């Protein structure tokens, strides 16, 4: 081995986990294996897709359908069985990956594409004081970043939001970009095939069979036929389920009637160009590149819409009682549905047609990436990791990757690790204690009084569990949670390695509780704070 | 869910409990297990003195996504009510909680709730987000007033 | 376009970046590769994944026990076997519809006509005279010439495109430009004692100088650095560094004495990164879709930065 | 007004104008608005110096037409 | 104290006098005085940056007599 032995033995004796079996993940794992790392933990929730083969060199064509972690492990046994590899087919947000699950590792690097998972692993590692190496890949772009507790800024020092979801209110009435109608189609799919998420509801709810146009012309009917509430707003999902998802009825409801209903807003179209309603009858009876890169005719899009809704109705019939269908970027039926809807909306608002290829591009927010940049990012990650394990954190630096050399004739740019921001609330040196207790017998009453009120002088405790989603366990106002004070912590899902945040409305000082399960405490006591 | 969002929401809850407008309500929702999730809230907005909506106590749910406070919360009245600026699915829109116009991460729960209150007190025409309420309020004002009174008595405390 | 549906699906990600036409030109492309240090293996893998229809690689050495225990292409315990034949199975497994070729003959003995059927040639772990020969042949044949290597935290690449044409995105929709580059004998043997080169030197990376030291040491010692002979070889690199830089007319202190402790190794990270950038350059040149970087790029791993530079234009 | 140049990580050229006392806050917000990217996703670098939120042109002291580097710490890995 | 330099779409300039740390009162009273039009259907752009309903000049970074221009309403979408 060409590595220095002081570091070679450290990497061959320590344990490092890498999260996400992406192309970056697979290249990272290969680099770690070649470097001499002995124990490596790999976790991924997704399976190998056909389009996934473009970058994941560890995954072959025959490997589609299996878990990413299992296939990555099998591939690394193809050239180095000696490495200790642990594979997990799960998501990081699963609570069993507690602070103790990260504390076991000497180093950890993220290879994720979703911002939420990245923030979660950031928080978990800062809880476990295990150094992190941040990275991301996009096309010919890339970067790496060291994340160290109390030395460098954490990934949450500068809050970076997740993917653009758009307000919804703009797209539901007046789309003006292809992205607008695409997210409109996604929301409509969630509305009439997914769960009853009223936020995703984008098609209007009314007396659906009526072809509404200026109800003020029938003002007496609008209050004599039905009471206040517009016939109690028949749900679009319920209407579609009751009508058996009739392609013609659905098409006219969401492309002719609702368009006129929108056209009732003359105050909106006095500035914006008014859209046009399309009817199924006239569209049907009016009389090279990839297969997805060419725009089709509105009649062909309507035919695709009908076929897609038929297939999706069949798939829903495969489910029970109308179970929701989760959207995906690879399902042919749902994707044909969304492209048809988006192109129909574009033709509605006098906008140009967009091919299925572009809808696939910006619908699932597929970020392009090349194995070149993926490889360089993984190499930067492992170089920074060996620097970290060597203790040369001062020499560790944030490195970006460029498609074109900068005017400073540099392609990989080094930047000093900025000190952590003192007030981002996650990397601050907030006081913490760990208390061992028997989860299955201690109750919320004891937790609130004995463990917090008198043990830490909290006069108004509102302890809160930071499970990665956010919920308060108890409230300072007794009228909010006193009904569940007799429950156990195991009843609320606080397992070993969990942690809670406590606060006071008058002492205005926060305190963090770390949970360790300890049956050995006996009967005389139910808890103990570790000194 | 970002930890910054969690800490910020905890601070907002503390500030709201310490000081909030009279007979207003803003609490995290009762989870099925009995806890409250601070990322999704139940709120109820009372009417203003002399206004047609006076006396009613209109229930409103607001949704916080992982990008808060960079992203605004998505609010929604349950059940949906008869107002031009609310989508009859219940969700409401205003520049206060829309990214591209005025949404500032530094703003708090109290001021956005006051914004929704004054929006209810200010039915606008230049930004219609619904049809039926818009056309009634634009053409036949007396029926709109009668329906507003009916709603106010419908959501009375 | 004669692109099949499943082949497009396997390439679906990169089409969204550089378009169908670049992929079609790659399907019309053939590449010659030489040398299989971790760098050769990674560059072969990345070219395979890129979508070039045919990759031909050449090497003159077997798998030896002194080689590291992992090369991520050759199978476990493939010692004694030819490295090309030890790797071809996994290399083809990386992408089934791309065909690969394995050559055991040394490029020194290889005839000039053998390079004609390739649009790009890649060189690794070879003597500078043979680099000159292959580069001048490539320039004569109007073919794009690339080379590069890795040694510890230090790595380099070179690219000579000759008369080259390419397109770019109009980033303040494609627009056509062109670029011209010079052979290695013009680039590598640049006279630094000239006033303009001397002026540019003070803001010129020393990575080229340590590369020249390494190259010389490779040519005269007949083998690459190996950890079992660190001390005597290290002193040899130091003294030959003095010899070359004072002969070239530059102060040896510009290459600090500790550079040996960094270069005297072969590591996966620095190998993988330089190979990735080399593959980026190769695919940009073959597709003519992105503007190639200038003839030289270097990497200092301990310093954690990469520099593109112009030498001997 | 005193002129400066900002060249993007993707070789995108954008050209902006500023005063010596005008906080770079405005400059970076303007850039991310023009590019349509969330603010915290961009890193601004001058000759290797990270541009802080509390920075002002008389502090880093550039000359006119000087280049200020931007790099975008993108997700999607 | 602050000299206001508000000009509407009709090129109408109205003068006001407010303190340094005015936060919302400035824009609220300017709206209520010049309105002719509902408040929500109007906006002022200040050095090309759209203000918030509490954006004070001291934390904006403007000073006396700085020119502030309104912009066409974006309520239509
Ligand atoms: N929460 C998560 N848990 C495990 N793996 C994940 C998670 N989020 C993303 N990944 C993986 O991270 C990789 C990122 O995508 P890509 O790099 O494009 O392959 C994929 O392999 C995903 O399956
Ligand atoms: Zn922090």
């Amino acid at each position: 081995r060409g590595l220095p032995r002081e570091l070679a033995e450290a990497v061959a004796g320590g344990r490092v986990l890498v999260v996400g079996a992406g192309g970056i993940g697979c290249e990272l794992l290969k680099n770690l294996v070649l470097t001499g790392f002995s124990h490596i933990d790999l976790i991924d929730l997704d399976t190998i897709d056909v389009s996934n083969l473009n970058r994941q060199f560890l995954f072959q064509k025959k490997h589609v359908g299996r878990s990413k972690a299992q296939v990555a492990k099998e591939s690394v046994l193809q050239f180095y069985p000696k490495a200790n590899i642990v594979a997990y087919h799960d998501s990081i947000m699963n609570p069993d990956y507690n602070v103790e699950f990260f504390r076991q590792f000497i180093l950890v690097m993220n290879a994720l594409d979703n911002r939420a998972a990245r923030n979660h692993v950031n928080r978990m590692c800062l809880a476990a004081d295990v150094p992190l190496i941040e990275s991301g890949t996009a096309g010919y772009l890339g970067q790496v970043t060291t994340i160290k507790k109390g030395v460098t800024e954490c990934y949450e020092c500068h809050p970076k939001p997740t993917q653009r979801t758009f307000p919804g209110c703009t797209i539901r009435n007046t789309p003006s970009e292809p992205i607008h109608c695409i997210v409109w189609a996604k929301y409509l799919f969630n509305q009439l095939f997914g769960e009853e998420d009223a936020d995703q509801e984008v098609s209007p709810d009314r007396a659906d069979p009526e072809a509404a146009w200026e109800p003020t012309e029938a003002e007496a009917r609008a209050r004599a036929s039905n009471e206040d509430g517009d016939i109690k707003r028949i749900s679009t999902k319920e209407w579609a389920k009751s009508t058996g998802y009739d392609p013609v009825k659905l098409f006219t409801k969401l492309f002719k009637d609702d368009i006129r209903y929108l056209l009732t807003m003359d105050k909106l179209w006095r500035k914006r160009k008014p859209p046009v309603p399309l009817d199924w009858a006239e569209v049907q009876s009016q009389g090279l590149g990839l297969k997805d890169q060419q725009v089709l005719d509105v009649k062909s899009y309507a035919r695709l819409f009908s076929k897609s809704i038929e297939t999706l109705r069949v798939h829903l019939a495969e489910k029970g009682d109308g179970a929701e269908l989760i959207w995906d970027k690879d399902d042919p039926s749902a994707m044909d549905f969304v492209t048809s809807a988006a192109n129909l909306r574009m033709h509605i608002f006098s906008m140009n047609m967009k091919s299925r290829f572009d809808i696939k591009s910006m619908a699932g927010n597929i970020i392009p990436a090349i194995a070149t940049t993926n490889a360089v990012i993984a190499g930067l990650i492992v170089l920074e990791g060996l620097k970290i394990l060597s203790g040369k954190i001062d020499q560790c630096r944030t490195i970006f990757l460029n498609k074109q050399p900068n005017p400073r004739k540099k392609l990989l740019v080094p930047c000093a690790l900025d000190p952590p921001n003192p007030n981002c609330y996650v990397c601050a040196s907030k006081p913490e204690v760990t208390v061992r207790l028997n989860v299955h017998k201690v109750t919320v009453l004891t937790l609130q009084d004995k463990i917090v009120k008198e043990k830490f002088a909290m006069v108004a405790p509102d302890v809160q569990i930071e499970d990665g989603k956010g919920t308060i366990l108890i409230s300072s106002e007794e009228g909010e949670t006193e009904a569940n004070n007799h429950k156990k912590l195991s009843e609320f899902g606080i397992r070993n390695g969990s942690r809670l945040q406590a606060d006071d409305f008058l002492q205005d000082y926060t305190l963090l509780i770390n949970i360790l399960h300890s049956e050995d405490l006996g009967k005389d006591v139910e808890f103990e704070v570790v000194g | 869910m970002s930890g910054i969002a969690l800490s910020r929401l905890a601070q907002e809850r503390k500030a709201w409990r310490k000081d909030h407008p009279a007979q207003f309500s803003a609490v995290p929702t009762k989870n099925p297990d009995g806890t409250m999730n601070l990322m999704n809230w139940e709120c109820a907005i009372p009417g203003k003195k002399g206004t047609p909506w006076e006396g009613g106590l209109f229930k409103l749910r607001m949704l916080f996504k992982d990008d808060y406070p960079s992203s605004p919360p998505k609010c929604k009245f349950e059940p949906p009510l008869f107002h031009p600026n609310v989508y009859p699915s219940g969700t409401v829109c205003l520049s206060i909680l829309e990214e591209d116009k005025d949404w500032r991460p530094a703003i708090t729960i109290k001021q956005i709730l006051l914004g929704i209150q004054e929006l209810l007190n200010e039915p606008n025409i230049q930004d219609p987000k619904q049809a039926e309420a818009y056309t009634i309020y634009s053409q036949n004002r007396v029926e709109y007033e009668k329906r507003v009174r009916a709603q106010a008595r419908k959501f009375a405390p | 376009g004669g692109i099949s549906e499943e082949e497009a699906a396997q390439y679906d990600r990169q089409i969204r970046l550089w378009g169908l036409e670049a992929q079609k030109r790659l399907r019309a492309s053939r590449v010659l590769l030489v040398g299989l240090k971790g760098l050769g293996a990674e560059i072969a893998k990345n070219l395979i994944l890129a979508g070039v229809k045919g990759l031909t690689m050449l090497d003159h050495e077997q798998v030896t026990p002194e080689d590291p225990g992992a090369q991520f292409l050759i199978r476990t315990g493939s010692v004694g076997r030819n490295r090309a034949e030890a790797s071809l199975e996994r290399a083809q497994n990386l992408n089934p519809m791309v065909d690969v070729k394995v050559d055991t003959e040394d490029i020194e003995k290889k005839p000039e006509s053998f390079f004609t059927q390739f649009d790009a040639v890649c060189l690794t772990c070879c003597s500078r005279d043979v680099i000159v020969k292959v580069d001048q042949i490539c320039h004569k044949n109007s073919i794009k010439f690339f080379t590069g290597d890795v040694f510890g935290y230090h790595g380099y690449t070179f690219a000579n495109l000759g008369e080259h044409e390419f397109v770019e995105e109009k980033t303040k929709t494609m627009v056509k430009k062109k670029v011209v580059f010079c052979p290695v004998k013009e680039a590598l043997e640049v006279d630094w004692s000239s006033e303009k080169a001397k002026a540019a030197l003070k803001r010129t990376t020393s990575d080229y100088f340590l590369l020249q030291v390494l190259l010389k040491f490779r040519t005269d010692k007949g083998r690459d650095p190996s950890s079992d002979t660190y001390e005597e070889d290290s002193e040899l690199l130091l003294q030959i560094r003095n010899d070359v830089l004072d002969s070239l007319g530059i102060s040896p202190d510009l290459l600090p004495e500790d550079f040996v402790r960094y270069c005297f190794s072969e590591m996966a990270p620095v190998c993988a990164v330089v190979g990735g950038i080399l593959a980026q350059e190769i695919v940009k040149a073959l597709s003519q879709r992105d503007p190639p970087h200038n003839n030289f790029f270097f990497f200092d791993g301990m310093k954690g930065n990469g520099i593109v530079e112009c030498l001997g234009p | 007004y005193i002129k400066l140049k900002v060249i993007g990580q993707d070789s995108s050229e954008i050209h902006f104008k500023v005063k010596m006392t005008t906080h770079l806050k405005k400059l970076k917000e303007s850039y991310c608005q023009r590019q349509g990217v969330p603010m915290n996703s961009l890193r601004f670098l001058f000759e290797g110096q990270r541009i802080a939120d509390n920075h002002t042109p008389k502090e880093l002291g550039m000359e006119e037409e000087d280049v200020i580097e931007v790099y975008q710490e993108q997700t999607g890995g």
Side-chain angles (χ1 to χ4, degrees), chain C residues 216-269:
Chain C
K216 192 45 224 335
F217 162 85
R218 220 60 61 81
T219 62
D220 53 37
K221 253 260 177 165
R223 37 139 286 190
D224 40 335
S226 179
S227 190
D228 55 324
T229 60
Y230 175 50
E231 277 73 12
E232 57 273 24
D233 297 349
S234 60
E235 287 294 338
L236 216 177
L237 325 172
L238 288 161
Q239 75 203 240
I240 197 60
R241 174 267 318 239
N242 308 343
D243 295 341
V244 301
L245 313 173
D246 304 56
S247 61
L248 196 54
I250 69 135
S251 66
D253 60 359
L254 191 50
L255 185 51
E257 322 312 280
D258 55 342
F259 84 100
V260 187
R261 193 166 61 252
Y262 311 136
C263 293
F264 207 94
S265 188
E266 170 87 327
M267 331 195 288

Side-chain angles (χ1 to χ4, degrees), chain A residues 1-3 5 8-9 11-14 26 28-40 57-58 71-86, chain C residues 67-78 89-90 268:
Chain A
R1 304 189 193 283
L3 280 74
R5 284 295 179 170
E9 305 311 314
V11 305
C26 287
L28 186 29
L29 151 73
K30 186 261 280 164
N31 296 355
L32 291 165
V33 155
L34 217 173
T35 313
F37 285 74
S38 61
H39 300 64
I40 300 97
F57 92 106
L58 283 184
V71 179
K73 183 173 174 169
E74 293 169 45
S75 55
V76 302
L77 268 12
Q78 300 310 299
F79 55 86
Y80 197 85
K82 186 173 290 180
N84 178 280
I85 305 304
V86 200
Chain C
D67 290 307
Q71 299 69 22
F72 104 89
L73 287 205
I74 74 184
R75 284 287 186 175
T76 56
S78 48
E89 174 255 319
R90 293 278 302 295

Side-chain angles (χ1 to χ4, degrees), chain A residues 340-403:
Chain A
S340 53
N343 275 297
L344 286 167
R345 287 282 280 189
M346 288 288 266
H347 192 279
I348 280 160
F349 281 81
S350 307
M351 281 156 88
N352 63 277
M353 221 62 72
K354 283 282 275 180
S355 92
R356 182 171 192 275
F357 185 79
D358 295 5
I359 308 330
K360 184 177 178 80
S361 183
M362 31 193 109
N365 188 338
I366 303 178
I367 282 316
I370 305 319
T372 63
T373 46
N374 251 35
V376 310
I377 294 313
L380 254 291
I381 271 164
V382 293
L383 160 46
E384 194 87 334
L386 76 96
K387 287 167 60 194
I388 280 291
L389 294 182
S390 78
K392 296 172 65 173
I393 315 188
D394 56 338
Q395 201 58 264
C396 264
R397 291 182 202 292
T398 36
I399 321 298
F400 287 79
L401 183 274
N402 307 261
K403 52 97 63 61

Side-chain angles (χ1 to χ4, degrees), chain C residues 10-169 173-298:
Chain C
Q10 174 209 57
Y11 295 147
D12 187 53
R13 297 301 213 244
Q14 65 196 9
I15 317 301
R16 261 187 283 287
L17 186 58
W18 53 39
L20 223 35
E21 197 66 21
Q23 196 66 26
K24 172 59 173 65
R25 286 208 281 242
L26 260 289
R27 296 211 315 155
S29 179
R30 299 189 70 76
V31 176
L32 173 58
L33 172 61
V34 174
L36 292 173
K37 251 74 254 106
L39 166 66
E42 173 296 338
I43 191 43
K45 153 217 83 61
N46 204 267
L47 261 160
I48 275 290
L49 261 290
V52 47
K53 75 153 168 178
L55 175 169
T56 298
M57 72 48 57
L58 163 154
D59 200 0
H60 202 208
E61 303 189 330
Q62 326 298 326
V63 183
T64 68
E66 61 183 55
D67 290 307
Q71 299 69 22
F72 104 89
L73 287 205
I74 74 184
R75 284 287 186 175
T76 56
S78 48
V79 67
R81 291 173 62 178
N82 166 35
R83 201 155 48 224
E85 81 97 3
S87 77
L88 39 65
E89 174 255 319
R90 293 278 302 295
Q92 278 283 173
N93 261 262
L94 301 175
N95 192 315
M97 64 44 60
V98 169
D99 54 351
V100 316
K101 300 299 297 181
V102 283
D103 283 50
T104 58
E105 182 69 297
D106 198 333
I107 190 156
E108 295 179 22
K109 287 170 274 164
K110 215 62 159 173
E112 181 172 41
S113 56
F114 182 79
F115 313 110
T116 59
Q117 69 279 3
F118 305 121
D119 319 328
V121 187
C122 265
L123 284 302
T124 321
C125 62
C126 155
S127 297
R128 72 198 316 287
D129 315 68
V130 199
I131 307 306
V132 171
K133 169 201 169 191
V134 181
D135 160 76
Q136 71 205 1
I137 286 169
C138 201
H139 165 61
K140 281 173 67 193
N141 299 0
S142 187
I143 302 169
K144 313 188 200 303
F145 184 88
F146 302 62
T147 165
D149 217 314
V150 53
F151 22 79
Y153 294 96
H154 273 117
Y156 91 121
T157 45
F158 159 84
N160 176 26
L161 294 312
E163 166 78 326
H164 185 74
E165 173 267 312
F166 54 93
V167 291
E168 310 116 320
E169 178 65 281
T173 186
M174 298 188 199
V175 59
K176 293 182 295 288
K177 320 322 160 54
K178 70 197 310 294
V179 77
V180 182
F181 286 106
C182 291
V184 298
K185 219 172 192 175
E186 242 276 35
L188 270 67
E189 322 294 63
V190 61
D191 178 24
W192 294 89
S193 57
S194 69
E195 294 299 330
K196 306 313 295 286
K198 181 61 60 164
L201 173 141
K202 66 177 181 287
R203 205 155 70 169
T204 293
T205 181
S206 56
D207 304 322
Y208 154 84
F209 302 126
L210 53 90
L211 150 74
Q212 288 272 45
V213 173
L214 249 337
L215 294 174
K216 192 45 224 335
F217 162 85
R218 220 60 61 81
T219 62
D220 53 37
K221 253 260 177 165
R223 37 139 286 190
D224 40 335
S226 179
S227 190
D228 55 324
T229 60
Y230 175 50
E231 277 73 12
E232 57 273 24
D233 297 349
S234 60
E235 287 294 338
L236 216 177
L237 325 172
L238 288 161
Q239 75 203 240
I240 197 60
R241 174 267 318 239
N242 308 343
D243 295 341
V244 301
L245 313 173
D246 304 56
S247 61
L248 196 54
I250 69 135
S251 66
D253 60 359
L254 191 50
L255 185 51
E257 322 312 280
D258 55 342
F259 84 100
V260 187
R261 193 166 61 252
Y262 311 136
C263 293
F264 207 94
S265 188
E266 170 87 327
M267 331 195 288
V270 50
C271 155
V273 288
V274 54
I277 324 190
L278 210 171
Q280 189 40 15
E281 291 216 280
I282 274 285
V283 69
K284 290 153 45 52
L286 294 177
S287 63
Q288 301 104 347
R289 179 58 231 278
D290 320 307
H293 332 115
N294 165 306
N295 65 357
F296 259 114
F297 144 71
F298 321 70

